[PDB]
Nucleic acid binder design. Sequence first.
RNA 1: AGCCGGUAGCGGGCGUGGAUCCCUGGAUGUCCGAAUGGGGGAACCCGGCCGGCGGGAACGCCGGUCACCGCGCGCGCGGGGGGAACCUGGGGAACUGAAACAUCUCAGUACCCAGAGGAGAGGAAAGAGAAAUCGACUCCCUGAGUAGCGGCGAGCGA
RNA 2: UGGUUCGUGGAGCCAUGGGGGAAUCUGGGCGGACCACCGCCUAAGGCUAAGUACUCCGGGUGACCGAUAGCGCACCAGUAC
RNA 3: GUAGGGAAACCGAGUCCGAACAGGGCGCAGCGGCCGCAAAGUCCGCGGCCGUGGACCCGAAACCGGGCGAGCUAGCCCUGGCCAGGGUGAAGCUGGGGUGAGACCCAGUGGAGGCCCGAACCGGUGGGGGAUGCAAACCCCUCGGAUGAGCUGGGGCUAGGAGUGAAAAGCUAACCGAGCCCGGAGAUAGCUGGUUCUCCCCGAAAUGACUUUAGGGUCAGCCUCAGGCG
RNA 4: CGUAGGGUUAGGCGGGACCUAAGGUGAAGCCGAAAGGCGUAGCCGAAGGGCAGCCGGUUAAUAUUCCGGCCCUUCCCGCAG
RNA 5: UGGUGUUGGCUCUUGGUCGCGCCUGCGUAGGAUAGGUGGGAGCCUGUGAACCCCCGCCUCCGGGUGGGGGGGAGGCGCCGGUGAAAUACCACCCUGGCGCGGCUGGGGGCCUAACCCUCGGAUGGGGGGACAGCGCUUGGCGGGCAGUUUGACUGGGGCGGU
RNA 6: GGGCCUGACUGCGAGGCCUGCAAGCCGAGCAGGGGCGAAAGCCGGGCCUAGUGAACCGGUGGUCCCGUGUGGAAGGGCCAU
RNA 7: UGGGAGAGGGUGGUGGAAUUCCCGGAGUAGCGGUGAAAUGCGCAGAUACCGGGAGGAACGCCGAUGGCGAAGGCAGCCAC
RNA 8: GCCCGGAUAGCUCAGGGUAGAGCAGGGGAUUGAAAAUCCCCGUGUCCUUGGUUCGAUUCCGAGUCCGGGCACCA
Lengths: 97, 146
Amino acid sequence: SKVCEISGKRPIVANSIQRRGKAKREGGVGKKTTGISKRRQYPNLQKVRVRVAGQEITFRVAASHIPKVYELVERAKGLKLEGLSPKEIKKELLKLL
Amino acid sequence: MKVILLEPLENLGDVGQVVDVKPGYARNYLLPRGLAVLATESNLKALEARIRAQAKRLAERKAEAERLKEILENLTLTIPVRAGETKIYGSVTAKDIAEALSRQHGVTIDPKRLALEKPIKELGEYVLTYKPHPEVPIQLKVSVVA
RNA sequence: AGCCGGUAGCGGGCGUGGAUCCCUGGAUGUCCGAAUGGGGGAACCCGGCCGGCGGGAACGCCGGUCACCGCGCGCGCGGGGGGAACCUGGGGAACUGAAACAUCUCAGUACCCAGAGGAGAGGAAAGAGAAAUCGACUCCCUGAGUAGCGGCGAGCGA
RNA sequence: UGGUUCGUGGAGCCAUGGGGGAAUCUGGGCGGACCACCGCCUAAGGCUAAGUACUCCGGGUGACCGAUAGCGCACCAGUAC
RNA sequence: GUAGGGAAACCGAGUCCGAACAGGGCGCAGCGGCCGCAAAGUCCGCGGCCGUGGACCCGAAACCGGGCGAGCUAGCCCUGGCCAGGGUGAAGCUGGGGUGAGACCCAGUGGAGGCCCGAACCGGUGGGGGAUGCAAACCCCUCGGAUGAGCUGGGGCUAGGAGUGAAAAGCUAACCGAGCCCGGAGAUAGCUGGUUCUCCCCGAAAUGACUUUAGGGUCAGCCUCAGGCG
RNA sequence: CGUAGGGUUAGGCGGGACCUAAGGUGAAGCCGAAAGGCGUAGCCGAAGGGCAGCCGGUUAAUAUUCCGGCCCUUCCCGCAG
RNA sequence: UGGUGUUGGCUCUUGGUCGCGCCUGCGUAGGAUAGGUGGGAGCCUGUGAACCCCCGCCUCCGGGUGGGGGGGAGGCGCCGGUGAAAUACCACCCUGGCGCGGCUGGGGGCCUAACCCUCGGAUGGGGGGACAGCGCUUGGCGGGCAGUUUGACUGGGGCGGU
RNA sequence: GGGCCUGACUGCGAGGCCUGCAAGCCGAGCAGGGGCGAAAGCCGGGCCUAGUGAACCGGUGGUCCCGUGUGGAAGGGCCAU
RNA sequence: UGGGAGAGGGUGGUGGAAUUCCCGGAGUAGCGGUGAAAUGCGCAGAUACCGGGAGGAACGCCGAUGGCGAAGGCAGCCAC
RNA sequence: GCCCGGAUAGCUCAGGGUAGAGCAGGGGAUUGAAAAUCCCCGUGUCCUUGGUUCGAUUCCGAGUCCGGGCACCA
Ligand SMILES: [Mg+2]
Ligand SMILES: [Mg+2]
Ligand SMILES: [Mg+2]
Ligand SMILES: [Mg+2]
Ligand SMILES: [Mg+2]
Ligand SMILES: [Mg+2]
Ligand SMILES: [Mg+2]
Ligand SMILES: [Mg+2]
Ligand SMILES: [Mg+2]
Ligand SMILES: [Mg+2]
Ligand SMILES: [Mg+2]
Ligand SMILES: [Mg+2]
Ligand SMILES: [Mg+2]
Ligand SMILES: [Mg+2]
Ligand SMILES: [Mg+2]
Ligand SMILES: [Mg+2]
Ligand SMILES: [Mg+2]
Ligand SMILES: [Mg+2]
Ligand SMILES: [Mg+2]
Ligand SMILES: [Mg+2]
Ligand SMILES: [Mg+2]
Ligand SMILES: [Mg+2]
Ligand SMILES: [Mg+2]
Ligand SMILES: [Mg+2]
Ligand SMILES: [Mg+2]
Ligand SMILES: [Mg+2]
Ligand SMILES: [Mg+2]
Ligand SMILES: [Mg+2]
Ligand SMILES: [Mg+2]
Ligand SMILES: [Mg+2]
Ligand SMILES: [Mg+2]
Ligand SMILES: [Mg+2]
Ligand SMILES: [Mg+2]
Ligand SMILES: [Mg+2]
Ligand SMILES: [Mg+2]
Ligand SMILES: [Mg+2]
Ligand SMILES: [Mg+2]
Ligand SMILES: [Mg+2]
Ligand SMILES: [Mg+2]
Ligand SMILES: [Mg+2]
Ligand SMILES: [Mg+2]
Ligand SMILES: [Mg+2]
Ligand SMILES: [Mg+2]
Ligand SMILES: [Mg+2]
Ligand SMILES: [Mg+2]
Ligand SMILES: [Mg+2]
Ligand SMILES: [Mg+2]
Ligand SMILES: [Mg+2]
Ligand SMILES: [Mg+2]
Ligand SMILES: [Mg+2]
Ligand SMILES: [Mg+2]
Ligand SMILES: [Mg+2]
Ligand SMILES: [Mg+2]
Ligand SMILES: [Mg+2]
Ligand SMILES: [Mg+2]
Ligand SMILES: [Mg+2]
Ligand SMILES: [Mg+2]
Ligand SMILES: [Mg+2]
Ligand SMILES: [Mg+2]
Ligand SMILES: [Mg+2]
Ligand SMILES: [Mg+2]
Ligand SMILES: [Mg+2]
Ligand SMILES: [Mg+2]
Ligand SMILES: [Mg+2]
Ligand SMILES: [Mg+2]
Ligand SMILES: [Mg+2]
Ligand SMILES: [Mg+2]
Ligand SMILES: [Mg+2]
Ligand SMILES: [Mg+2]
Ligand SMILES: [Mg+2]
Ligand SMILES: [Mg+2]
Ligand SMILES: [Mg+2]
Ligand SMILES: [Mg+2]
Ligand SMILES: [Mg+2]
Ligand SMILES: [Mg+2]
Ligand SMILES: [Mg+2]
Ligand SMILES: [Mg+2]
Ligand SMILES: [Mg+2]
Ligand SMILES: [Mg+2]
Ligand SMILES: [Mg+2]
Ligand SMILES: [Mg+2]
Ligand SMILES: [Mg+2]
Ligand SMILES: [Mg+2]
Ligand SMILES: [Mg+2]
Ligand SMILES: [Mg+2]
Ligand SMILES: [Mg+2]
Ligand SMILES: [Mg+2]
Ligand SMILES: [Mg+2]
Ligand SMILES: [Mg+2]
Ligand SMILES: [Mg+2]
Ligand SMILES: [Mg+2]
Ligand SMILES: [Mg+2]
Ligand SMILES: [Mg+2]
Ligand SMILES: [Mg+2]
Ligand SMILES: [Mg+2]
Ligand SMILES: [Mg+2]
Ligand SMILES: [Mg+2]
Ligand SMILES: [Mg+2]
Ligand SMILES: [Mg+2]
Ligand SMILES: [Mg+2]
Ligand SMILES: [Mg+2]
Ligand SMILES: [Mg+2]
Ligand SMILES: [Mg+2]
Ligand SMILES: [Mg+2]
Ligand SMILES: [Mg+2]
Ligand SMILES: [Mg+2]
Ligand SMILES: [Mg+2]
Ligand SMILES: [Mg+2]
Ligand SMILES: [Mg+2]
Ligand SMILES: [Mg+2]
Ligand SMILES: [Mg+2]
Ligand SMILES: [Mg+2]
Ligand SMILES: [Mg+2]
Ligand SMILES: [Mg+2]
Ligand SMILES: [Mg+2]
Ligand SMILES: [Mg+2]
Ligand SMILES: [Mg+2]
Ligand SMILES: [Mg+2]
Ligand SMILES: [Mg+2]
Ligand SMILES: [Mg+2]
Ligand SMILES: [Mg+2]
Ligand SMILES: [Mg+2]
Ligand SMILES: [Mg+2]
Ligand SMILES: [Mg+2]
Ligand SMILES: [Mg+2]
Ligand SMILES: [Mg+2]
Ligand SMILES: [Mg+2]
Ligand SMILES: [Mg+2]
Ligand SMILES: [Mg+2]
Ligand SMILES: [Mg+2]
Ligand SMILES: [Mg+2]
Ligand SMILES: [Mg+2]
Ligand SMILES: [Mg+2]
Ligand SMILES: [Mg+2]
Ligand SMILES: [Mg+2]
Ligand SMILES: [Mg+2]
Ligand SMILES: [Mg+2]
Ligand SMILES: [Mg+2]
Ligand SMILES: [Mg+2]
Ligand SMILES: [Mg+2]
Ligand SMILES: [Mg+2]
Ligand SMILES: [Mg+2]
Ligand SMILES: [Mg+2]
Ligand SMILES: [Mg+2]
Ligand SMILES: [Mg+2]
Ligand SMILES: [Mg+2]
Ligand SMILES: [Mg+2]
Ligand SMILES: [Mg+2]
Ligand SMILES: [Mg+2]
Ligand SMILES: [Mg+2]
Ligand SMILES: [Mg+2]
Ligand SMILES: [Mg+2]
Ligand SMILES: [Mg+2]
Ligand SMILES: [Mg+2]
Ligand SMILES: [Mg+2]
Ligand SMILES: [Mg+2]
Ligand SMILES: [Mg+2]
Ligand SMILES: [Mg+2]
Ligand SMILES: [Mg+2]
Ligand SMILES: [Mg+2]
Ligand SMILES: [Mg+2]
Ligand SMILES: [Mg+2]
Ligand SMILES: [Mg+2]
Ligand SMILES: [Mg+2]
Ligand SMILES: [Mg+2]
Ligand SMILES: [Mg+2]
Ligand SMILES: [Mg+2]
Ligand SMILES: [Mg+2]
Ligand SMILES: [Mg+2]
Ligand SMILES: [Mg+2]
Ligand SMILES: [Mg+2]
Ligand SMILES: [Mg+2]
Ligand SMILES: [Mg+2]
Ligand SMILES: [Mg+2]
Ligand SMILES: [Mg+2]
Ligand SMILES: [Mg+2]
Ligand SMILES: [Mg+2]
Ligand SMILES: [Mg+2]
Ligand SMILES: [Mg+2]
Ligand SMILES: [Mg+2]
Ligand SMILES: [Mg+2]
Ligand SMILES: [Mg+2]
Ligand SMILES: [Mg+2]
Ligand SMILES: [Mg+2]
Ligand SMILES: [Mg+2]
Ligand SMILES: [Mg+2]
Ligand SMILES: [Mg+2]
Ligand SMILES: [Mg+2]
Ligand SMILES: [Mg+2]
Ligand SMILES: [Mg+2]
Ligand SMILES: [Mg+2]
Ligand SMILES: [Mg+2]
Ligand SMILES: [Mg+2]
Ligand SMILES: [Mg+2]
Ligand SMILES: [Mg+2]
Ligand SMILES: [Mg+2]
Ligand SMILES: [Mg+2]
Ligand SMILES: [Mg+2]
Ligand SMILES: [Mg+2]
Ligand SMILES: [Mg+2]
Ligand SMILES: [Mg+2]
Ligand SMILES: [Mg+2]
Ligand SMILES: [Mg+2]
Ligand SMILES: [Mg+2]
Ligand SMILES: [Mg+2]
Ligand SMILES: [Mg+2]
Ligand SMILES: [Mg+2]
Ligand SMILES: [Mg+2]
Ligand SMILES: [Mg+2]
Ligand SMILES: [Mg+2]
Ligand SMILES: [Mg+2]
Ligand SMILES: [Mg+2]
Ligand SMILES: [Mg+2]
Ligand SMILES: [Mg+2]
Ligand SMILES: [Mg+2]
Ligand SMILES: [Mg+2]
Ligand SMILES: [Mg+2]
Ligand SMILES: [Mg+2]
Ligand SMILES: [Mg+2]
Ligand SMILES: [Mg+2]
Ligand SMILES: [Mg+2]
Ligand SMILES: [Mg+2]
Ligand SMILES: [Mg+2]
Ligand SMILES: [Mg+2]
Ligand SMILES: [Mg+2]
Ligand SMILES: [Mg+2]
Ligand SMILES: [Mg+2]
Ligand SMILES: [Mg+2]
Ligand SMILES: [Mg+2]
Ligand SMILES: [Mg+2]
Ligand SMILES: [Mg+2]
Ligand SMILES: [Mg+2]
Ligand SMILES: [Mg+2]
Ligand SMILES: [Mg+2]
Ligand SMILES: [Mg+2]
Ligand SMILES: [Mg+2]
Ligand SMILES: [Mg+2]
Ligand SMILES: [Mg+2]
Ligand SMILES: [Mg+2]
Ligand SMILES: [Mg+2]
Ligand SMILES: [Mg+2]
Ligand SMILES: [Mg+2]
Ligand SMILES: [Mg+2]
Ligand SMILES: [Mg+2]
Ligand SMILES: [Mg+2]
Ligand SMILES: [Mg+2]
Ligand SMILES: [Mg+2]
Ligand SMILES: [Mg+2]
Ligand SMILES: [Mg+2]
Ligand SMILES: [Mg+2]
Ligand SMILES: [Mg+2]
Ligand SMILES: [Mg+2]
Ligand SMILES: [Mg+2]
Ligand SMILES: [Mg+2]
Ligand SMILES: [Mg+2]
């Protein structure tokens, strides 16, 4: 999953740490690491289809910023978006960010 | 998620009412069907702007009726008709009463807004209910003489 | 005061009316190349449009123009690619060391990619941290192999 | 999860992929868990010379080399092969 | 450097353990007549050795990163081409016989087949030769296939823990149980080799303990030098 | 082999100004930290399709190319139907 | 593979905890169905009692109880008999019930609109459907792959022994 | 064999044995508070020599030594195991 | 020529009883089986009961000491 | 170490107001026998202790012993 079009969130590299043993705070000798290896954390990307100026527009957006899409639909009402291509409607909508 | 209902709805609320719904219900049903709008602050006071504009246009009309109530219960419409002792030869109709009201006292009146089914055929003194807007019914004392 | 590059020779020329030569600006600048009319096995091939040339309509040649993307209300402006090291960002090993080895080390190094420029990053405190204190950031010395971190091992290190 | 000297540690701070999700100074973040007190600072917009790094290029200089040395190449070399 | 002792609070020529004024640990310190010299210590030079670096030089088999290769070879895709001549004689068909009708039998016709013999072409069975070759796989004789799961030209696709494989760990550009090139890189090598002028004095060890140690190390033993003692 | 001079002549032969095959590339569109990977059409791509020249002579050296003889194709313009 | 996000509508049946309501509680001794204690000589009844028809009921099968139709001066306590424990009323509670309300969590049926597939017709129709997919997180299986470890002495090494 | 007992002590320890290190061993005597004995005295386990495990990491009881601006706290140190 | 009886044969259809399995419901401590037992099945809900479904095989009564066929052999019902 | 539990007749399985049942055993009935079957009969500090209660299998606490289950291991 790529990139949130609203927030800019992209995949990040994170480590996966495998541990063993009883934590010191429970009276164990302590944790031991039996393996670190790289992995990726992805944004919770989802599709959002809205209809703006009689055209259908799809956003790829992280669940966190799903509300931010409809917020753009509101702010787009004061714009003269008729006749524009769906691709051009999106560009204008994203300009309000 | 708070929304502004744009129509009365099943066990939901009356039009203009601000209700809390699950976000999925708002995003994928109400909003795409114009049934409601998310209660953002922007169009949230646009609601009270209307609750203000209507409540100003209502109380106005409940005032422009009293400006006829007190101006009509403080007079009498006397109407002369050729009549034999009791019975009018012609009659006095709503339109007649209106025409006579604008005649003498200038007051203009919707005759269809006056409660009189059959045209009056008898001399005497009559009190006829006028309804220029409900909850402001006017009692017009009219006098058909000869 | 000599000159026509290395380069003498044949055969011919130029220079005190200032040549050759040196510096600056300009003109010309085939074809390929980001290569950008289209195609292509780079330096070849094939077109549209306006104008010209030939006897010229077919054919050919000459000049101009014609990619794509982004931004601004069809027209403009910009982008593309290159650069020894240096710089920032996105990714990122292993040999090796631990006299075996896995955490750890090597090292955020080598290297890949994107970007920038003569530098780049950083930068005007939601800072430091104990002084009733200081006062952006960067860079050098010192603080200090200190404080600490660490199969409290090898080592790492403000 | 990453960064930091900090390898889960009493683990704060700075950054953030996931979930939940405020307030506008009487608001908020920090002083190494946490609480009180006392202080420090004002996050979620951006720009900013100079001091710093490098050496394709120019010059200056060597208790630097002197043709098996010094650049791979003093010469028609990134050539011949 | 001028103060140390203590885990520390802390005390201080002391301090720590301790109930102790007990004991013990670790600490505490010039020559000759105020003047000279010498000395704490510290700074710079020089030399020996040690730590960190590739650290005396040369040498792996390997590991990792980024590229380059299917013009060899392996498989597949697209489009073309090639296989002299001879032999055997399936089905079917026709006719005859047969029967209630049939099955079926006979003859002719027919021309099937990972069929037969054999060139081209594709192979490589046995022997001989060759062995600083004509040749980093060749030559002679012999032998297998030769209408098929056949051979072959041209155009393409698939590759490095990956491809491809009628499977041999085969092949992937003349060495593949993990290609090649450049890079990390001077990897590491307790191993092997090598280590360059002269003279003078002294002169070992091959044992003990411990050691994932045993042909490697730490300490001791044994050699040497400087100062001291006598 | 060294030095020098000469030598390759096309509307019809082969390829291009024609077609498409695998495959490659690729408006639309899809996907991926970056680099890039896909992808219908379309475009590219041939030893496949398509398309008009045969015989003889000549040079030291080219010839279906030059010449000779006899044939043929497309494009442009015109006339006729 | 649990939780959660993307993820919504309507139903039905449930469980768990919280607060309130009304009870349920019968070994033997004895009026009878005696929770535990404490209080306490009065609770009551025209603010409908002693009897008849419906049951919610639970019954230990003897009974306890409520609201209804009955109903128009009556009740049961202290008194007591054997009790560890007196019976009325009140009150706080124990072990259980159900009734309501709360937070909830579980299942089951349906719906369509997210999401997915499909339809020469695409602001639509059909199918799947809040499942699947995908994000974050939990535990599990896991030579398919990866990095490695797999001791020394030894009349050669292994085996044996140590 | 019996009586009384807990020295199967606390705080130290001159001097030695052994020995590469690290360990292992013997130990008189002083102080505290005890046991036995009339006393001299003896007693810091066992006639003796095997019955064992460095460090790291953590547990527990005690101490109240450190406590990240301050008071606490988290977490360490020290003694014992 | 006109008649008759018949499980004579072959083909295609088709009906109800029973068994078994499957699903739903209702219900609980055993069911099964034998000379007697055991193995087996059952609280993961069997047996016994009701409703729904699937599938194969054989045709009760009529039926007889019967009928038909060369024999082997032929039995729900229907048509050819 | 911690959580969940047990202990009841020889064996085993159930359980505030009982000390139960089956299996093993004893006799009798039965057959030809082995049995099945039939009647009866036994065999307990209910682990110990302390308390709750009028009373203790029960309820609580503390030991013991054995079950379980869980984590850790320098
Ligand atoms: Mg993890
Ligand atoms: Mg602790
Ligand atoms: Mg760990
Ligand atoms: Mg650790
Ligand atoms: Mg991984
Ligand atoms: Mg998406
Ligand atoms: Mg959506
Ligand atoms: Mg929509
Ligand atoms: Mg979020
Ligand atoms: Mg959220
Ligand atoms: Mg009238
Ligand atoms: Mg000349
Ligand atoms: Mg001349
Ligand atoms: Mg002059
Ligand atoms: Mg002059
Ligand atoms: Mg001049
Ligand atoms: Mg110039
Ligand atoms: Mg071009
Ligand atoms: Mg091109
Ligand atoms: Mg022109
Ligand atoms: Mg001409
Ligand atoms: Mg012209
Ligand atoms: Mg022209
Ligand atoms: Mg042209
Ligand atoms: Mg042009
Ligand atoms: Mg580029
Ligand atoms: Mg650039
Ligand atoms: Mg960099
Ligand atoms: Mg970086
Ligand atoms: Mg980098
Ligand atoms: Mg990697
Ligand atoms: Mg690593
Ligand atoms: Mg490593
Ligand atoms: Mg390694
Ligand atoms: Mg190293
Ligand atoms: Mg190593
Ligand atoms: Mg090593
Ligand atoms: Mg190794
Ligand atoms: Mg390693
Ligand atoms: Mg590491
Ligand atoms: Mg290194
Ligand atoms: Mg590192
Ligand atoms: Mg570098
Ligand atoms: Mg500068
Ligand atoms: Mg700058
Ligand atoms: Mg500011
Ligand atoms: Mg500062
Ligand atoms: Mg200040
Ligand atoms: Mg300030
Ligand atoms: Mg300043
Ligand atoms: Mg210092
Ligand atoms: Mg560290
Ligand atoms: Mg380190
Ligand atoms: Mg570190
Ligand atoms: Mg580091
Ligand atoms: Mg730093
Ligand atoms: Mg760090
Ligand atoms: Mg960290
Ligand atoms: Mg870290
Ligand atoms: Mg930290
Ligand atoms: Mg934070
Ligand atoms: Mg976050
Ligand atoms: Mg404030
Ligand atoms: Mg606040
Ligand atoms: Mg903060
Ligand atoms: Mg914070
Ligand atoms: Mg804080
Ligand atoms: Mg601070
Ligand atoms: Mg501050
Ligand atoms: Mg600020
Ligand atoms: Mg900021
Ligand atoms: Mg700047
Ligand atoms: Mg300035
Ligand atoms: Mg600067
Ligand atoms: Mg220079
Ligand atoms: Mg120079
Ligand atoms: Mg010199
Ligand atoms: Mg020299
Ligand atoms: Mg030379
Ligand atoms: Mg040289
Ligand atoms: Mg020389
Ligand atoms: Mg030299
Ligand atoms: Mg150079
Ligand atoms: Mg040079
Ligand atoms: Mg050289
Ligand atoms: Mg050279
Ligand atoms: Mg050359
Ligand atoms: Mg100290
Ligand atoms: Mg003390
Ligand atoms: Mg002393
Ligand atoms: Mg002392
Ligand atoms: Mg000195
Ligand atoms: Mg030396
Ligand atoms: Mg040394
Ligand atoms: Mg080095
Ligand atoms: Mg060295
Ligand atoms: Mg390796
Ligand atoms: Mg390896
Ligand atoms: Mg590679
Ligand atoms: Mg390649
Ligand atoms: Mg090939
Ligand atoms: Mg090939
Ligand atoms: Mg090829
Ligand atoms: Mg072919
Ligand atoms: Mg053939
Ligand atoms: Mg033939
Ligand atoms: Mg043949
Ligand atoms: Mg033949
Ligand atoms: Mg024949
Ligand atoms: Mg023949
Ligand atoms: Mg035949
Ligand atoms: Mg035929
Ligand atoms: Mg025939
Ligand atoms: Mg015949
Ligand atoms: Mg035949
Ligand atoms: Mg044949
Ligand atoms: Mg054959
Ligand atoms: Mg053959
Ligand atoms: Mg033959
Ligand atoms: Mg043969
Ligand atoms: Mg061959
Ligand atoms: Mg072969
Ligand atoms: Mg051979
Ligand atoms: Mg032979
Ligand atoms: Mg041979
Ligand atoms: Mg050979
Ligand atoms: Mg041969
Ligand atoms: Mg031959
Ligand atoms: Mg031969
Ligand atoms: Mg042959
Ligand atoms: Mg042959
Ligand atoms: Mg043949
Ligand atoms: Mg043959
Ligand atoms: Mg064939
Ligand atoms: Mg074939
Ligand atoms: Mg072929
Ligand atoms: Mg081929
Ligand atoms: Mg070939
Ligand atoms: Mg392939
Ligand atoms: Mg490939
Ligand atoms: Mg490989
Ligand atoms: Mg590789
Ligand atoms: Mg493979
Ligand atoms: Mg093969
Ligand atoms: Mg090669
Ligand atoms: Mg090669
Ligand atoms: Mg090869
Ligand atoms: Mg091989
Ligand atoms: Mg390998
Ligand atoms: Mg490898
Ligand atoms: Mg290799
Ligand atoms: Mg090769
Ligand atoms: Mg090579
Ligand atoms: Mg490279
Ligand atoms: Mg490099
Ligand atoms: Mg290295
Ligand atoms: Mg090295
Ligand atoms: Mg090397
Ligand atoms: Mg190695
Ligand atoms: Mg070695
Ligand atoms: Mg050597
Ligand atoms: Mg040597
Ligand atoms: Mg000497
Ligand atoms: Mg001597
Ligand atoms: Mg020795
Ligand atoms: Mg020895
Ligand atoms: Mg060894
Ligand atoms: Mg050995
Ligand atoms: Mg060995
Ligand atoms: Mg040797
Ligand atoms: Mg060795
Ligand atoms: Mg030594
Ligand atoms: Mg000696
Ligand atoms: Mg000596
Ligand atoms: Mg010495
Ligand atoms: Mg001496
Ligand atoms: Mg002497
Ligand atoms: Mg020649
Ligand atoms: Mg020629
Ligand atoms: Mg011609
Ligand atoms: Mg043309
Ligand atoms: Mg073409
Ligand atoms: Mg084409
Ligand atoms: Mg595009
Ligand atoms: Mg890709
Ligand atoms: Mg592509
Ligand atoms: Mg394609
Ligand atoms: Mg074309
Ligand atoms: Mg192409
Ligand atoms: Mg083409
Ligand atoms: Mg062609
Ligand atoms: Mg052709
Ligand atoms: Mg042609
Ligand atoms: Mg012809
Ligand atoms: Mg000719
Ligand atoms: Mg010729
Ligand atoms: Mg000819
Ligand atoms: Mg001709
Ligand atoms: Mg999951
Ligand atoms: Mg969910
Ligand atoms: Mg449904
Ligand atoms: Mg549903
Ligand atoms: Mg729908
Ligand atoms: Mg539907
Ligand atoms: Mg659709
Ligand atoms: Mg639809
Ligand atoms: Mg639908
Ligand atoms: Mg889901
Ligand atoms: Mg979770
Ligand atoms: Mg997992
Ligand atoms: Mg495994
Ligand atoms: Mg392995
Ligand atoms: Mg494997
Ligand atoms: Mg697997
Ligand atoms: Mg493997
Ligand atoms: Mg090992
Ligand atoms: Mg060995
Ligand atoms: Mg040996
Ligand atoms: Mg041996
Ligand atoms: Mg021996
Ligand atoms: Mg021997
Ligand atoms: Mg031997
Ligand atoms: Mg052994
Ligand atoms: Mg004795
Ligand atoms: Mg005794
Ligand atoms: Mg005594
Ligand atoms: Mg004592
Ligand atoms: Mg001593
Ligand atoms: Mg010693
Ligand atoms: Mg040692
Ligand atoms: Mg000992
Ligand atoms: Mg004493
Ligand atoms: Mg005494
Ligand atoms: Mg005494
Ligand atoms: Mg005494
Ligand atoms: Mg003593
Ligand atoms: Mg004794
Ligand atoms: Mg360790
Ligand atoms: Mg410790
Ligand atoms: Mg403690
Ligand atoms: Mg303190
Ligand atoms: Mg603090
Ligand atoms: Mg503090
Ligand atoms: Mg306080
Ligand atoms: Mg304090
Ligand atoms: Mg503490
Ligand atoms: Mg502590
Ligand atoms: Mg502690
Ligand atoms: Mg007949
Ligand atoms: Mg059932
Ligand atoms: Mg059973
Ligand atoms: Mg059962
Ligand atoms: Mg059950
Ligand atoms: Mg079936
Ligand atoms: Mg018969």
